[PDB]
Design a protein around this ligand. Structure first.
Ligand SMILES: [Zn+2]
Lengths: 172, 143, 191, 137, 52
RNA sequence: GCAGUCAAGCGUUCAUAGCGACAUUGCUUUUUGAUUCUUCGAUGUCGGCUCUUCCUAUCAUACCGAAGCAGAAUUCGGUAA
RNA sequence: AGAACUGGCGAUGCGGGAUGAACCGAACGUAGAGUUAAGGUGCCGGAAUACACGCUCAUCAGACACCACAAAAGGUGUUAGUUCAUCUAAGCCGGACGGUGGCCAUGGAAGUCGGAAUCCGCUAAGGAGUGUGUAACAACUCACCGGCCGAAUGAACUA
């Protein structure tokens, strides 16, 4: 829950003489360190298969780096979450350079707008959106128009000293 | 569907072009509840009249760019609301039978369709007097 | 959601010249010249040609964006006011005591003065706003007509005249007396 | 007057090809180009020539300059270089007061104590010849 | 007395209005919500009542 | 004690002008209880008189919006102590 | 008011919670240097008027566990989301109507007091006159009305 890395977690049920070689399951988990990621792996597995980590084991844990960490992409994000009064699915879009960058703004946004802390959200799917205008959401489409430019009116420069011998301007 | 229904208008209209030789486009801008319509059964041994929603009516036209392109000349007269008399002859007598239904103050025609032409209508052939004395009137003026 | 740009357009007709500098707008036409301070809204003007000036908000939320059209309009009515002009018409309406209405002055001032309203011994006075000029129709009974370049000033001066005749303590559905706005439009260009 | 006059704020635009001066961080001091806009707050930049690594940056740690050059959006580092060079961006920058003051201020800061002393002595010389001028016309 | 058309004129002002049911505001006749903050901009409106 | 939400009903007709059942959310601390924390080597009961000040859930008075407001009279409501 | 297990207060200062028996931190010989806890760092006051993405404007905003209260119910305020439907065959401006006062009732009773159904139908508009005026004419004017229209749109909802 912080500056996110994304991990492959791969686990399985412990072998039995009856079933050596039990099936392997993978999740992609966003977390900040690997102790959290494996926790998170088990949290989800327990809600999906009978297994507690006391009957299972983690076979591999590997960080998945962004393939094109400077191509700008538009991501579709699918999320399940709890409100003070129920639980909701929700599709949002995020424009960024990496999943890991996108996911982090997802979490800030769920916090800002819906007052959803991390314990309350599940990431359902995160996906680069291939064709522009499969993009559904205005506030990301806006950036997709041709020869896009804008000013940044009213610039405030931070001052290094407490007094200034001239009245400042906001001119950019 | 409603694009079925859009298409539906398209479907039938094309069919009516391909079912008549003449066509009178009669303006049906304004004019409304019960009267004329009920005369039209009686006049439906000559024609089909169809009233309908305009953008739909226009897009029918777009679908007919494929052939019979002379209907393009109907196009500047699509405006407002117009309606059809699919037709064979007279365009200047039968037409006037169609016209007569009881005026309002001419109920209510303001445009003509005459197979690439747009008459009053009131002149089309009656004596061949634009083909024996006006197809040789500057042959008359100069031999 | 913040709209990265959003803009409106202001047609300048022949014969008028609008000039704007730090949101103080000066509009000049055949009828006269109006000015208006727009400093209370962050909008940016941009002249495309002399027929057409644009107004944008950059990176603005809803309520900001709502300010955009309204600036366009205000500036539009400046242009109309100084070409076609504004004219509002009113009617005296009274069931019994005829409402007796004149112009009077004090210190070269000018007031609309209203007498006998519902039989009142009191006299009502409404200052005539500068720029707005009062007539009385010749061939519509009980008419009163305010005109000028400023819809704002014409319309408010008409409002002042009607608000001054309200009828207190009576069922105002039965007692309908008043001076009411009866038509509103332009000086030039038919009626 | 008789033309409609409307002075319009001539803002430096965030746009592909806009060149920016990096305020903070490790690339502090260097020029990079906006390659692609991310949102109202972030952009992809790239400063191959100054050796600032193509990266997503927050506009608040950058300052827009008046310079801009032709660059197709999304352009990878290689073609950013080709274009930046074609355009002669550093040439233009160097020529600006802005870049000159930075240089001036940099040079002052490197002055030795002996050097500071010489500047004093030279200043006093210039002063002298100035005050007699400012006294004749 | 008072020609039909001026009675009508007077009524656009005096009677073709709706009324907030919480706070009583005289409101535009086609309004959906009360403009007043004291009643919470309620949309509980009724027509102003017509004379006899 | 005081105020709401729903609206079946009242109100010739018409839920909500004025009201409002079945239910239901609250507020107050001049009612009365419940408690027993302080005071039993002491804090002088009830009412009145006198006098000052404060609250507002406003009876009058100022200006308003509603009405089953024609007028007069009233009634509902706002800003108001 | 009364029990269960544990930890506390009572018997206990110290740092934080402005204040405060019982909360948080941490328990105590006399001191030096360093580091932290809980808690903080605009100014009162030691410590970034630090960095980052949003959200919020309150003619009664809000601001941090124990803790110094607020609910049902509402909002076309603004935010993000959901579902259904329309759309390359948002959304806007006008078309919403006849047979049959159809068939039971009964000024009327039609979709339009009330009973039971609502079947079919067709695609184009001048009220023997709204008023002035005449006992009544003349003149001007208006009624099932809209140009529609241009990658989104409509409705119902969640928080
Ligand atoms: Zn209200």
């Amino acid at each position: 829950m912080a500056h996110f890395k994304e991990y492959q977690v791969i686990g399985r049920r412990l072998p039995t003489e009856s079933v050596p070689e039990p099936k392997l399951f993978r999740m992609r988990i966003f977390a900040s360190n690997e102790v959290i990621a494996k926790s998170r792996y088990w949290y989800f597995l327990q809600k999906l298969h009978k297994v507690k980590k006391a009957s299972g084991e983690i076979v591999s844990i590997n960080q998945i780096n962004e393939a094109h960490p400077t191509k700008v992409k538009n991501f579709g994000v699918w999320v399940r979450y709890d409100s003070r009064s129920g639980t909701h699915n929700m599709y949002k879009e995020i424009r960024d350079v990496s999943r890991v960058a996108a996911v982090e703004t997802l979490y800030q946004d769920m916090a800002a707008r819906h007052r959803a802390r991390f314990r309350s959200i599940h990431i359902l799917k995160v996906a680069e959106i291939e064709k522009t205008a499969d993009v559904k959401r205005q506030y990301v489409k806006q950036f997709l128009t041709k020869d896009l430019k804008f000013p940044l009116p009213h610039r405030v420069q931070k001052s290094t000293k407490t007094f200034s011998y001239k009245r400042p301007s906001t001119f950019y | 569907g409603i694009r079925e229904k859009k298409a539906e208008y398209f479907a039938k209209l094309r069919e009516y072009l391909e079912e008549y030789k003449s066509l009178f486009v009669v303006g049906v801008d304004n004019v409304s509840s019960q009267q004329m319509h009920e005369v039209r059964k009686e006049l439906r041994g000559r024609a089909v009249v169809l009233m309908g929603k305009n953008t739909m009516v226009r897009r029918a036209i777009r679908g007919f760019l494929s052939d019979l392109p002379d209907f393009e000349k109907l196009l500047p007269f699509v405006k407002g609301n117009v309606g059809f008399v699919f037709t064979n002859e007279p365009l200047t007598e039968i037409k006037n039978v169609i016209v007569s239904n009881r005026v309002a103050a001419g109920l209510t025609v303001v445009q003509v369709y005459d197979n690439g032409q747009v008459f009053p209508s009131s002149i089309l052939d009656i004596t061949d007097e634009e083909l024996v004395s006006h197809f040789v009137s500057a042959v008359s003026t100069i031999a | 959601m913040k709209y990265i740009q959003t803009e409106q357009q202001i047609e300048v007709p022949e014969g008028v010249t609008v000039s704007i500098k730090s949101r103080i707008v000066k509009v000049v036409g055949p009828r006269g010249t109006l000015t208006k301070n727009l400093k209370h809204i962050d909008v940016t003007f941009t002249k495309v040609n002399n027929q057409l000036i644009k107004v944008a908000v950059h990176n603005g939320g809803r309520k900001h964006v709502a300010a955009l059209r309204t600036v366009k309009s205000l500036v539009d009515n400046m242009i109309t006011g100084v070409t076609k002009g504004y004219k509002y018409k009113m009617r005296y309406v009274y069931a019994h005591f005829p409402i007796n209405v004149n112009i009077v002055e004090k210190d070269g001032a000018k007031f609309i003065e209203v007498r006998n309203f519902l039989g009142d011994k009191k006299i009502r006075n409404v200052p005539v706003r500068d720029g707005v000029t009062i007539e009385f129709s010749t061939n519509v009974k009980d008419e009163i007509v305010l005109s000028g370049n400023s819809v704002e000033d014409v319309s408010q001066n008409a409002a002042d005249l009607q608000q001054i005749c309200r009828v207190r303590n009576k069922d105002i559905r039965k007692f309908l007396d008043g001076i009411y706005v009866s038509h509103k439009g332009f000086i030039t260009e038919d009626l | 007057s008789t033309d409609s006059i409307v002075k319009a704020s001539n803002w430096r635009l965030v746009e592909v090809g806009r060149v920016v001066l990096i305020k903070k961080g490790q690339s502090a001091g260097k020029l990079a180009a906006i390659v692609e806009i991310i949102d109202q707050k972030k952009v992809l930049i790239d400063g191959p020539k100054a050796g600032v690594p193509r990266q997503a940056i927050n506009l608040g740690q950058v300052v827009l300059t008046p310079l801009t050059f032709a660059l197709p959006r999304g352009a990878r580092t290689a073609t950013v270089s080709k274009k930046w060079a074609a355009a002669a961006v550093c040439e233009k920058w160097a020529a600006s007061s802005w870049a000159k003051k930075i240089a001036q201020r940099e040079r002052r800061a490197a002055l030795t104590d002996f050097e500071r002393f010489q500047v004093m002595v030279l200043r006093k010389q210039k002063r002298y010849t100035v005050k007699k001028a400012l006294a004749k016309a | 007395i008072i020609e039909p058309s001026l009675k009508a004129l007077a009524s656009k002002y005096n009677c073709d209005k709706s009324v907030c049911r919480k706070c009583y505001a005289r409101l535009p006749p086609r309004a959906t919500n009360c403009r007043k903050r004291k009643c919470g901009h309620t949309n509980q409106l009724r027509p102003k009542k017509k004379l006899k």
